[PDB]
Design a protein around this ligand. Structure first.
Ligand SMILES: *[C@@H]1O[C@H](CO[C@@H]2O[C@@H](C)[C@@H](O)[C@@H](O)[C@@H]2O)[C@@H](O[C@@H]2O[C@H](CO)[C@@H](O[C@@H]3O[C@H](CO[C@H]4O[C@H](CO)[C@@H](O)[C@H](O)[C@@H]4O)[C@@H](O)[C@H](O[C@H]4O[C@H](CO)[C@@H](O)[C@H](O)[C@@H]4O)[C@@H]3O)[C@H](O)[C@H]2NC(C)=O)[C@H](O)[C@H]1NC(C)=O
Ligand SMILES: *[C@@H]1O[C@H](CO)[C@@H](O[C@@H]2O[C@H](CO)[C@@H](O[C@@H]3O[C@H](CO)[C@@H](O)[C@H](O[C@H]4O[C@H](CO)[C@@H](O)[C@H](O)[C@@H]4O[C@H]4O[C@H](CO)[C@@H](O)[C@H](O)[C@@H]4O)[C@@H]3O)[C@H](O)[C@H]2NC(C)=O)[C@H](O)[C@H]1NC(C)=O
Ligand SMILES: CCCCCCCCCCCCCCCC(=O)O
Ligand SMILES: *[C@@H]1O[C@H](CO)[C@@H](O)[C@H](O)[C@H]1NC(C)=O
Lengths: 99, 267
């Protein structure tokens, strides 16, 4: 049966405003494996996002990691938005500026 | 201990469309991918061929190639014969490999899930349903067990090929498998958060401290992967404000020596 994705957003290096960094969006616990993942900068789709190969855990649920170059600043928001048959609407999780 | 796990994921949408993709891990490091759109198995490490020769690797690859076509045909044939009782879409996953233990020791496995639930395993010399699996699986599994050639090959692959190939991998991949990468930490925040990122291998200790005393309220989050074969973890501590003064996050990790990272809240 279907399992809804969990989404966590976190940065590879300490986030310091103005310093280039990598933002990660890890999407886990979902089934079936077909899914759509976008990373957003101020609500707009970021073009070059890299994804890992989809894989699954011991409990059979799927997972995938997306990541993109980004520069945190005082005025930009970032987010990860997922579309999946288990949800009526796309689900979006904002980076909290700390992680 | 290292576990080698070959993960196959096959999706069937209708009589006309399906795909199978696999990924292979040794411990927490990916060694291969095999995309449905690819004729051949891709290496994700310079040592992914282990100690096999180009010709053994080719024979082994050719068997898998044959298996991937056979698998697909056999499942579609199986859905036709059951129609209309087993409905599209169908999701089948297999996890197969071996776990290498202290000394010469290894154990192999082959588990199969259908619609996200474990239903079948290969054990001993045959395929079996696991208790609680749907009873329509009994007949096709009895049939597959009458296929002596497949049973011998699967027995060989699990009991012999797997451990031998993996010993070659651990030899060939030694310097990546034993790599050491140092974490960086930072603090944010009521709830104090110690973020620790970039460490490898996975074992790590992270704690909120006041002086010498470990703060028992420390909650370790989940380990989250970074995209460069390193790990991320945070540890959080709930604290009455003002009260933040004197706390530090301490990180102990093999890559650091005995030079722990110590970050004091308040600078
Ligand atoms: C590969 O290794 C297999 C063992 O390893 C397990 O499964 C594999 C796939 C991996 O996952 C691995 O990590 C696992 O540890 C090995 O399977 C073994 O095969 C032999 C036959 O070749 C089996 O022997 C027969 O056993 C039955 C008894 O079975 C029951 O009882 C035993 C315990 O008492 C249980 O362990 C079983 O699970 C069952 O509950 C006997 O009735 C039978 O005797 C009859 O046949 C023989 C001729 O072979 C005559 O000599 C006798 O007198 C009788 O007529 C056999 O002794 C053994 O059960 C089986 N193990 C398991 C767990 O099933 C496989 O053979 C290896 N294959 C190769 C090619 O290397
Ligand atoms: C995962 O991988 C597997 C295995 O590689 C894929 O399975 C194969 O998919 C291929 C490509 O679709 C398929 O080849 C078809 O065989 C058909 C008969 O069964 C042919 O009729 C068909 O030919 C048409 O398309 C070709 C290009 O793909 C054209 O070159 C050709 O001229 C044909 O074009 C005519 O007919 C088509 C309709 O098919 C039409 O659109 C055109 O306009 C024109 O009328 C293909 O050659 C194999 O049969 C499959 N091989 C298997 C199963 O072993 C599988 O699809 C992959 N899954 C995904 C999702 O990617
Ligand atoms: C079914 C037993 C598999 C274990 C045998 C160990 C041999 C190593 C194979 C490495 C590459 C395999 C790629 C996986 C192909 C697939 O699952 O469809
Ligand atoms: C089978 O499913 C595929 C994948 O969803 C879909 O695009 C298509 O409608 C189906 N193909 C046919 C011929 O119905």
């Amino acid at each position: 049966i279907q399992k809804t994705p969990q989404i966590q957003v976190y940065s590879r290096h300490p986030p310091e405003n103005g310093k280039p960094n990598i933002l990660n969006c890890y999407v886990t616990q979902f089934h079936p494996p077909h899914i759509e993942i976008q990373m957003l900068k101020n609500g707009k789709k970021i073009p070059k996002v890299e994804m890992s190969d989809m894989s699954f855990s011991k409990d059979w649920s799927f997972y995938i990691l997306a990541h993109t170059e980004f520069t945190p600043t005082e005025t930009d928001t970032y987010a990860c938005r997922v579309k999946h048959a288990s949800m009526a609407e796309p689900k979006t999780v904002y980076w909290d500026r700390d992680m | 201990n290292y576990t080698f796990r070959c993960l196959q994921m096959s999706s069937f949408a209708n009589r006309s469309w399906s795909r199978t993709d696999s990924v292979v891990w040794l411990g927490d490091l990916q060694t291969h991918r095999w995309s449905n759109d690819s004729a051949t198995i891709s290496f994700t490490k310079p040592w992914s061929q282990g100690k096999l020769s180009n010709q053994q690797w080719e024979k082994l690859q050719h068997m898998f190639q044959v298996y991937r076509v056979s698998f697909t045909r056999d499942i579609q044939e199986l859905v036709k014969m059951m129609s209309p009782k087993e409905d599209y879409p169908i999701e089948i996953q297999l996890s197969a490999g071996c776990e290498m233990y202290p000394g010469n020791a290894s154990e192999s496995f082959l588990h199969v899930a259908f619609q996200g639930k474990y239903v079948v395993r290969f054990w001993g010399t045959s395929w079996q349903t696991v208790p609680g699996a749907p009873s329509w699986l009994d007949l096709p599994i009895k049939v597959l067990n009458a296929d002596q050639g497949t049973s011998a090959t699967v027995q060989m692959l699990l009991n012999d090929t797997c451990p031998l190939f993996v010993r070659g991998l651990l030899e060939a991949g030694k310097s990546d498998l034993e790599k050491q990468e140092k974490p960086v930490a930072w603090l944010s925040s009521r709830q104090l958060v110690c973020h620790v990122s970039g460490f490898y291998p996975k074992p790590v200790w992270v704690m909120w401290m006041r002086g010498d005393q470990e703060q028992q309220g420390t909650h370790r989050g989940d380990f989250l992967p970074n995209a460069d074969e390193t790990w991320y973890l945070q540890a959080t501590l709930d604290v009455e404000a003002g009260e933040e003064a004197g706390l530090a996050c301490r990180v102990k990790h093999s890559s650091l020596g005995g030079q722990d990272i110590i970050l004091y809240w308040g600078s």
